[PDB]
Design a protein around this ligand. Structure first.
Ligand SMILES: CCCCCCCC/C=C\CCCCCCCC(=O)O[C@@H](COC(=O)CCCCCCCCCCCCCCC)COP(=O)([O-])OCC[N+](C)(C)C
Ligand SMILES: CCCCCCCC/C=C\CCCCCCCC(=O)O[C@@H](COC(=O)CCCCCCCCCCCCCCC)COP(=O)([O-])OCC[N+](C)(C)C
Ligand SMILES: CCCCCCCCCCCCCCCCCCCC(=O)O[C@H](COC(=O)CCCCCCCCCCCCCC)COP(=O)(O)OCCN
Ligand SMILES: CCCCCCCCCCCCCCCCCCCC(=O)O[C@H](COC(=O)CCCCCCCCCCCCCC)COP(=O)(O)OCCN
Ligand SMILES: CCCCCCCCCCCCCCCCCCCC(=O)O[C@H](COC(=O)CCCCCCCCCCCCCC)COP(=O)(O)OCCN
Ligand SMILES: CC(C)CCC[C@@H](C)[C@H]1CC[C@H]2[C@@H]3CC=C4C[C@@H](OC(=O)CCC(=O)O)CC[C@]4(C)[C@H]3CC[C@]12C
Ligand SMILES: CC(C)CCC[C@@H](C)[C@H]1CC[C@H]2[C@@H]3CC=C4C[C@@H](OC(=O)CCC(=O)O)CC[C@]4(C)[C@H]3CC[C@]12C
Ligand SMILES: Cn1c(=O)n(CCCO)c(=O)c2c1nc(Oc1cccc(Cl)c1)n2Cc1ccc(Cl)cc1
Ligand SMILES: Cn1c(=O)n(CCCO)c(=O)c2c1nc(Oc1cccc(Cl)c1)n2Cc1ccc(Cl)cc1
Ligand SMILES: Cn1c(=O)n(CCCO)c(=O)c2c1nc(Oc1cccc(Cl)c1)n2Cc1ccc(Cl)cc1
Ligand SMILES: [Ca+2]
Ligand SMILES: [Ca+2]
Ligand SMILES: [Zn+2]
Ligand SMILES: [Zn+2]
Ligand SMILES: [Zn+2]
Lengths: 668, 153, 43, 668, 51
């Protein structure tokens, strides 16, 4: 048997103290009033007594939404400490106003204040009631603040400090508290969400709560935008300056839902097709023919802009869709010339051919455009693209190609056959660099999948799965290096000279593979190519009759195969499946954000000419304020409607019925 | 049939990657093109017993990059008669990067896309099938075309 | 003492969470019918 | 503008007819009574008038659970047609009893009867009330009935006949209607679920409804079993005969949930470990050592059973777990001898060796056991196993091996080297058949994964994914045959003799592959081996300089590769993923059903000795009835509790409040 | 339910102590052999109460 008793005992209620609490719970006004009047004379009942759940009479009255009994208790001067917090959490309008007009256990932490709790509940009525007075919320310090107060509070009590900061940010991120008491709710939501995301990054713990607060602020901004009812209002909102200034601010703060708003996208599309008014309703063949015709005429449009920008053709290229088509056509012609560039080879450092002479201005235009973007946009914007890295690599490789071509031209004159050229001859290195540059240039077309409806979200999904690929890369590389070390340690004794080989060819790229694991570099390459099955098995064989050594090397190779293919590759497939399922829900919003960035990149005057042709306030504030007031009214009404459209509800219904019953019985 | 659409969508990105690396490999290797007479059996190309001239021309380079997907392109095709070890290594690295992309990255992404699409379209498979079968049944309700070939002529 | 405080807080929090069925509607109907019968008898 | 009017018009209510209906809806008893009394004198209000929703006054009263107004309307003789059906569907006790004691539009089909609708609602109170009278439900005919009435009804109205049959089976499959008015609820549920599954198979349409009805019956049987409270009751239930007779009947009807009941499994486990009382609580090492010791002593136990079955060792093998261990050990020794059988080869038809002489009695025992099982169990039970197919194949291959060995022994005496033997020499065919038999025998161990907790559900999952594999097999084979036909048609002109080949080797299994597509059989094999990458590319080359033909053949081969690997194999992976996710929820129940079948296979006296040693009522009904009565009471109480633990509820609450309000206002 | 549990613990109530997980005393084996279903149900109910 296990005896069961009360380990942590408390003070039990008296027989009367229990009858009085039961009367309060049942809502019988007459008996509660009689008990209150009798307590003043006889002092037999403690009006502040708790219950087995810790609730006093006032807390019971508040929880039952019994305003009459509550007010009766207040008129008898019962203990009221922290009752306002319970009234605010209960989200009952009557309790606050009643209570507003006037160390025990508490369900609320000491740092909770009435306005902070009201902001936590996100109840517009109670928040407005509290803001009607003079209430304040403490300002949180910097995310990486190092003042004496912050470090002192962190060292004295880290839990209390973290809890207080989280409560403050929960209060500030309240959509209702931003709807009121905020000059610019949209900008406030943007910057508050950004700061909450930064806190989520910094705070390893409480990361989920800061993430959800930031997401809540983002959704509040998106809903405020949703309340717009006319194009005039939407233009006023997006063009406000603290064109499309506020849209640019939203893009800066990574407000993807706000940018992907259907009305925002519709306005951006009307700006995107400046020239064509009816591009929305056209057939596939008509659109394709128009795109082909505009692309084939890109040199004409560029020349017209160069000569006279003010004409039917001079300013026709400044239109965003037309400019995009011209740049894409220019890049396509550049790639076509790159393909044609491989259609006498014994000359050491030959002069550039006609195709190379045509290619050169495109490379110069690419470099000039990159440096112009760096000079104009800035440094942080240039490095935030993450596509400028490939552009920088292409430009550097092209510059190295040109330098090596010049070196080979001015250092070699004779025509020696390539068979006897040096391994590190300048022409060979230049050609290798040019080939790598061609690969990168042709691969640069991936960034244009954003402009397409069918290819955009797919590109987003593949880009976000590249992160899982990168994560798997580390473990694969560790395994690869481990087995490379083992195989090299085992096999480096039997290294053979190239002369001994049947065709004077040494390594794994010969017709008969040999010396697969003789050196660490060759071992790494061999383990790489065994992933694709191009490494033959006999490479695990040695000329000496060391069958144990051969078997051990073969077993190492087989274990590497088993891991890298059976275990690691299937785990990679599983990770990709999970990540793609996770990111399939938000593909459209991310794609629309990326496409908005692409479209806005073509809204600027600078960079109009594609290569190689590039080398040749009070009233506005008042309008924004009135639009914001209308949006806030509409948002508040809509959210109240949505919330209107628990066991405590049934408890309140029972309380109302019982109070009515007791009143009727007393009257009769 | 409905997963063929995802296959088609993946086809564009695969073809872009294939063309890019074909351009690079052809640019690198077209200097060492050899006549068919020089080959051991007077056979030139990748369909010979000893593969040769895998990347000499753009058409052959495209075919070679196609067959490397199925592992039928041998590694020694990245080797040249001249002792240009840097050129051979660069070509081998281009070929290895193409292998890595097309197999490790692109094929697994294709598998993930197919999984998602098949899970999406598994709920409505019965209704779509019944619609298609109704169309098939109704195609045989008409008087015309009663006699199958060759009796229709 | 820390455990006593934790137990109090946990009990209050879990009661709050539980507070925040067809039998509830049956009880409401029962209360209404009992009130109705009492009023009818009194009148 | 689009004019909107009433296309299908009706007869509008009068001003009074609307006020009277509104009074009925609000529950005002006094005004309804006054209107009813005034209608008898003045005939100004039609008491049977509908509303815009088609409901009459009686239907409104029923829907509001207003028994007083309902009874008032009944006392005034209002139209009552089909009101009982609405009362039953509303699941209100008062309406039925009231109505029970006493071609317009209807929400119920003409074939619906009060008892049928009550059974559809599965409401025990109303079903019991209706069964208290003399009510009947029509008997559905056979699933494949061909009587004149069935075909006449099907031809006259297929929709009506199908609807009537489905309604009847919905009525009969009611758990409450089976709890009452059924001699044996468990057997009734079993056979009714089986018949519903058969109907689901037969009825291509309405398949989901019959499937869910069958599943509902299965769950009802499982819940009835769940209500058992003691081992005596469970034994009485499982041992009832219309031992473990009812358990066998459940297994026959594929009642997987009933068999996988935790109490049923616990009883079956206590029977399974007859010898060991405390096998449940033992360490892994102890269990493994005990299993090894029992397995190594299987010949001793078999001999002891053969000599004296009545001893500490004679009857120790009749225990189910011990018998299973002995049979498994016997099969393992047989496989060990098969492995040893490959440790002078020029003799044509040699005499059997010592290992073969030891193998022979095991084969004879296998054949004798198979034919004994066929003779005892029957034919349908033998073919329902689906594992007896592999056993039959093994036995046939072994018999063919023995026959060919005898033929080669009695037809050849000389010792000729194998190099010059005939292709179809009897010894070679016998050896090939024996090798195939060895493969099948070793693969037969898959069926023992059922006995294991970790390997059982995995085997179930793999077996159920084999169905998806089979489905994909058809499309793969169609594609394979198509491309084989194309490649053979293209390449059969350049067929070369084996002499012309470098090593006199023709086909794809030579060191230099040749004639890959010369014949259809070889083309099929070549397309098969290209799936695994073992077909080299140069097989698409011909000696003639027909470069167009070579390219076309290579393109056909490449398209086959693309389909079979990129498209078909990934689609197979996707299908397997979906099917495995689908069947992962029910893996445990299916595994427990399979393991119960395996355990019960070792409960019988027959087949006790493994190879090769096998070749050397009223009171029971009363107890079952009382147990079933207790189970039905408990099940009814539990299900009512579960159901107790809609907008119509709030409508009823409003109706009660309004009726109380009107009564109080009238009284005051 | 904390209120009812507290009300019952206010009196002198006890819950039987479950034996060892691998207990082999005479009482456990006797109860298991006489009625395995009842014994298992009682143990599960006791552990539901204690947890
Ligand atoms: C993006 C990077 C841009 C810059 C590229 C790097 C600079 C290129 C510039 C290269 C010019 C180097 C001098 C060449 C002079 C030739 C004569 C000579 O002195 O040979 C000397 C050795 O020469 C070497 O070792 C060359 C090594 C080139 C490595 C290139 C790595 C990057 C290419 C892959 C990029 C992948 C990018 C993937 C994305 C002496 O040799 P020796 O003593 O006679 O023996
Ligand atoms: C389960 C099935 C059991 C029965 C097996 C079939 C019976 C086996 C019995 C075979 C004995 C046949 C007679 C042999 C006589 C030898 C001399 C002779 O006359 O050769 C003759 C030809 O002989 C043949 O064509 C043999 C063909 C064997 C095909 C086996 C297929 C099944 C094996 C795979 C099973 C996979 C199972 C996968 C699961 C004449 O040749 P010729 O004119 O000289 O030229
Ligand atoms: C020594 C000899 C060396 C020879 C080397 C030969 C091979 C040449 C190197 C090949 C590098 C391939 C880089 C692929 C670019 C990455 C990319 O496209 O990201 C896409 C998503 O982009 C986005 O979402 C935006 C971010 C873009 C980042 C781009 C980074 C490029 C870095 C280049 C270095 C993926 O999209 P998807 O193709 O999966 O669809
Ligand atoms: C130069 C030398 C060239 C040599 C070429 C040798 C190879 C010959 C070409 C092979 C083409 C394969 C076409 C496969 C047909 C597509 C198809 O069956 O669609 C099914 C679904 O159909 C549907 O759902 C209805 C739409 C049907 C569209 C059919 C389009 C056929 C276009 C042919 C061109 C897929 O179904 P499943 O097989 O995945 O199952
Ligand atoms: C000419 C020369 C021919 C040479 C042939 C050489 C190869 C010999 C043939 C190999 C056949 C493999 C049969 C595999 C048995 C099927 C099986 O084990 O089903 C398991 C599930 O079983 C179940 O769930 C119960 C059903 C069992 C059906 C067994 C059917 C055997 C039919 C044999 C014919 C799968 O389970 P898992 O292994 O996926 O896990
Ligand atoms: C696919 C293989 C054969 C290589 C093809 C090389 C190029 C000819 C292809 C590859 C990617 C294609 C681009 C992919 C993305 C688009 C988006 C597309 O924009 C639209 O979808 C119309 C709606 C809009 O963008 O406003 C314009 C065509 C373009 C630039 C394509 C032009 C042709 C490109 C550059
Ligand atoms: C795995 C490779 C090395 C081939 C092994 C051949 C056999 C030695 C293995 C393969 C499958 C094994 C069997 C798989 C299933 C079981 C279930 C197992 O039963 C239990 O799990 C204990 C609980 C119970 O069954 O009552 C008894 C061992 C046995 C027969 C195993 C015995 C050893 C087997 C036959
Ligand atoms: C990692 N590995 C490997 O490298 N080689 C290459 C060796 C050089 O030829 C294998 O052949 C191999 C293997 N794994 C295997 O199958 C298992 C699966 C589970 C456990 C164990 Cl121990 C083995 N095999 C097959 C094999 C089984 C039994 C025997 Cl006796 C000998 C070979
Ligand atoms: C794309 N690729 C490739 O084309 N070849 C063929 C080269 C011609 O033989 C590789 O051998 C290769 C490779 N990727 C690899 O593994 C990683 C993984 C992450 C980052 C890096 Cl940098 C390398 N290897 C193996 C290897 C590792 C280290 C060294 Cl020092 C040398 C080879
Ligand atoms: C089905 N198939 C095939 O059988 N062979 C073997 C031919 C015999 O060597 C291919 O080489 C092949 C291929 N598919 C491919 O890539 C696409 C992808 C989408 C559309 C098209 Cl049209 C092609 N290639 C590569 C290739 C691309 C362009 C050119 Cl010009 C020539 C070869
Ligand atoms: Ca750029
Ligand atoms: Ca059998
Ligand atoms: Zn600070
Ligand atoms: Zn019939
Ligand atoms: Zn015990």
């Amino acid at each position: 048997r296990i005896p069961l008793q009360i380990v942590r005992a408390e003070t039990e209620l008296s027989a009367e103290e229990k009858a009085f609490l039961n009367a309060v719970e049942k809502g019988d006004y007459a008996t509660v009033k009689q008990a209150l009047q009798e307590a003043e004379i006889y002092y037999n009942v403690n009006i502040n007594c708790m219950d087995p759940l810790g609730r006093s009479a006032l807390l019971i009255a508040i929880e039952n939404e019994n305003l009459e009994i509550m007010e009766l208790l207040l008129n008898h001067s019962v203990y009221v400490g922290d009752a306002l917090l319970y009234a605010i959490r209960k989200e009952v309008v009557g309790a606050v106003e009643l209570l507003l007009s006037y160390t025990q256990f508490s369900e609320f932490t000491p740092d909770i204040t009435p306005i902070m709790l009201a902001a936590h509940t996100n109840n517009y009525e109670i928040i407005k009631l509290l803001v009607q007075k003079r209430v304040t919320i403490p300002r949180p310090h910097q995310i990486r603040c190092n003042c004496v107060e912050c470090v002192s509070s962190s060292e004295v009590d880290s839990l209390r400090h973290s809890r207080s900061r989280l409560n403050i940010y929960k209060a500030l991120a309240s959509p209702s508290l931003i709807a009121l008491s905020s000059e610019d709710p949209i900008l406030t939501a943007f910057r508050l969400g950004w700061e909450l995301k930064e806190l989520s990054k910094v705070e390893n713990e409480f990361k989920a709560e800061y993430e959800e607060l930031s997401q809540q602020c983002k959704l509040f901004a998106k809903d405020l935008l949703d309340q717009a009812r006319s194009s005039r209002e939407l233009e006023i909102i997006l063009n406000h300056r603290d064109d499309l200034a506020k849209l640019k601010v939203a893009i800066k703060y990574h407000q993807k839902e706000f940018v992907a708003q259907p009305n925002c996208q519709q306005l951006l599309a009307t700006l995107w097709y400046d020239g064509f008014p009816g591009w929305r309703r056209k057939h596939w063949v008509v659109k394709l023919l128009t795109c082909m015709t505009i692309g084939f005429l890109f040199p004409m449009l560029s020349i017209a802009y160069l000569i006279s920008p003010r004409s039917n053709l001079g300013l026709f290229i400044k239109k965003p869709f037309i400019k995009f088509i011209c740049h894409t056509a220019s890049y396509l012609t550049f790639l076509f010339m790159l393909l044609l560039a491989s259609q006498d080879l014994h000359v050491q450092g030959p002069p550039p051919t006609v195709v190379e002479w045509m290619i050169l201005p495109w490379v110069l235009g690419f470099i000039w455009g990159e440096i112009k973007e760096m000079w104009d946009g800035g440094f942080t914007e240039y490095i935030h693209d993450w596509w400028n890295l490939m552009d920088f690599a292409m430009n550097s490789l092209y510059l190295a190609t040109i330098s090596l071509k010049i070196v080979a031209y001015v250092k070699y004159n004779g025509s020696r056959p390539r068979e006897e050229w040096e391994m590190w001859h300048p022409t060979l290195i230049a050609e290798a660099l040019f080939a790598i540059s061609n690969i990168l240039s042709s691969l640069r077309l991936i960034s244009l999948f954003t402009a397409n409806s069918h290819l955009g979200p797919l590109q987003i999904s593949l880009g976000r799965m590249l992160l899982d690929i990168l994560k798997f890369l580390f473990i694969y590389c560790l395994v690869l290096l481990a087995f490379a070390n083992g195989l090299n340690q085992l096999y480096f004794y039997y290294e053979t000279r190239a002369i001994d080989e049947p065709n004077n060819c040494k390594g794994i790229r010969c017709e008969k593979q040999n010396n697969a694991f003789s050196t660490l570099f060759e071992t790494l390459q061999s383990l790489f190519w065994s992933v694709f099955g191009l490494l033959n098995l006999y490479v695990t064989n040695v000329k000496a009759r060391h069958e144990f050594t051969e078997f051990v090397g073969a077993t190492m190779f087989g274990t590497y195969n088993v891991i890298s293919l059976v275990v690691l590759l299937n785990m990679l497939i599983a990770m990709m499946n999970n990540s793609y399922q996770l990111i399939a829900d938000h593909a459209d919003i991310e794609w629309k954000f990326a496409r908005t960035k692409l479209w806005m990149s073509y809204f600027d005057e600078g960079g109009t000419l594609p290569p190689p042709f590039n080398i040749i306030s009070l009233i506005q504030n008042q309008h924004y304020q009135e639009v914001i007031r209308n949006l806030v009214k509409r948002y508040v009404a809509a959210m109240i409607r949505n919330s209107k459209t628990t066991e405590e509800n049934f408890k309140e219904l029972k309380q109302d019925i019982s109070s009515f019953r007791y009143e009727v019985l007393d009257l009769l």
